[PDB]
Amino acid sequence: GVPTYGAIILDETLENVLLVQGYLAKSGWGFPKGKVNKEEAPHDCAAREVFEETGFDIKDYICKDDYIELRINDQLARLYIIPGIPKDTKFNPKTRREIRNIEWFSIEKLPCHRNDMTPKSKLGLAPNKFFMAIPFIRPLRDWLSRRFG
Ligand SMILES: c1csc(-c2ncc[nH]2)c1
Numbered sequence: 191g192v193p194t195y196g197a198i199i200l201d202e203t204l205e206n207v208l209l210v211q212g213y214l215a216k217s218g219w220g221f222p223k224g225k226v227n228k229e230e231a232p233h234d235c236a237a238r239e240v241f242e243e244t245g246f247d248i249k250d251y252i253c254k255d256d257y258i259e260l261r262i263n264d265q266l267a268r269l270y271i272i273p274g275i276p277k278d279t280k281f282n283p284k285t286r287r288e289i290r291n292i293e294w295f296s297i298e299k300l301p302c303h304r305n306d307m308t309p310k311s312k313l314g315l316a317p318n319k320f321f322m323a324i325p326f327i328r329p330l331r332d333w334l335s336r337r338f339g
Pocket residue numbers: 262321322323324325
């Protein structure tokens with residue numbers, strides 16, 4: 191799989207994160223990210239995808255060692271951590287044919303797993319509009335604990 195790169199953008203209080211909503215297969219809410227181009231450097235892919243999806247330029251704020259990286263079905267996804275972006279920042283995507291909406295969400299209110307259906311004696315998980323974000327929520331909480339207490 192081609193690796194993906196993007197960002198976890200937080201506000202000044204460290205309470206809230208920035209999610210984007212796409213269309214169709216990407217119909218729920220997720221962190222802004224995308225596939226790396228041939229010969230493009232990881233920090234440059236992250237800034238590019240985040241600028242296309244949100245209109246905000248992170249290049250001056252990336253810290254090369256501050257990220258969370260997960261492998262999901264043998265595809266690597268890395269999101270650079272970008273704290274202290276004011277909640278009154280105007281975000282506007284390039285690509286409104288790809289992005290429906292852009293919003294701030296409370297970190298403590300986001301799920302870090304989906305719910306089962308063991309009320310109904312049925313296997314699997316119930317749908318959740320935060321599917322794409324879920325896998326990063328517990329590692330982000332643990333990384334904020336370590337770096338800021
Ligand atoms: C693939 C992309 S996100 C994802 C996931 N979210 C929650 C559990 N697995 C799998």
